[PDB]
């Protein structure tokens, strides 16, 4: 509260570390469904069903232009990618399985990097 300061973690490396994590995401072989925005005019349903589209290229642009206030807002956008994927795609499908794989991949890197 006012003039009662909670000891804070060092966040000076967060931008670099998130950029590193995102690079590993972008280069994962199962990243292909997530590299670019879903094409809203070639994919029936998507615009109506998915209220907040998100993809790695959009996250990269936001990270490069100071649009994430903190690391948690970055992780929210990454998770949004996989939450959208689960909403729209069957688990069995190639895209659906890619999403599950990439979520698992991200969350381990997230824990290993920041839950130091």
User: What resolution, expressed in A, was reported for this entry?
Assistant: 1.6
- 104 lies in which domain range? 1-116
**CB 29: neighbour CB atoms within 10 A?**
7
Q: How many folded domains does the chain comprise?
A: 1
| C-alpha–C-alpha distance, residues 46 and 61, integer Å | 22
CATH code of the domain in which 95 resides: 1.20.920.10
| C-alpha–C-alpha distance, residues 85 and 97, integer Å | 9
User: Three-state DSSP class for 64?
Assistant: helix
The two three-digit tokens of residue 27, written as one number = 């280069």
> Please, are residues 85 and 95 in contact by the beta-carbon 8 Å criterion?
yes
Residue ranges of E strands in 1-116:
none
| C-alpha–C-alpha distance, residues 46 and 64, integer Å | 27
| C-alpha–C-alpha distance, residues 97 and 36, integer Å | 18
| C-alpha–C-alpha distance, residues 32 and 43, integer Å | 16
Q: CA quadruple 30, 77, 111, 22: dihedral positive or negative? A: positive
């Amino acid at each position: 509260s006012m003039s009662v300061k909670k000891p804070k973690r060092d966040d000076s490396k967060d931008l670099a570390l998130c950029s590193m994590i995102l690079t590993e995401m972008e280069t994962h072989e199962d990243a292909w469904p997530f590299l670019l925005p879903v094409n809203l005019k070639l994919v029936p349903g998507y615009k109506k069903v998915i209220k907040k589209p998100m993809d790695f290229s959009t996250i990269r642009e936001k990270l490069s232009s100071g649009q994430y206030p903190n690391l948690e807002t970055f992780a929210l956008d990454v998770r949004l990618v996989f939450d959208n994927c689960e909403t729209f795609n069957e688990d069995d499908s190639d895209i659906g399985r890619a999403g599950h794989n990439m979520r698992k991949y991200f969350e381990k890197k997230w824990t290993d990097t920041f839950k130091v």
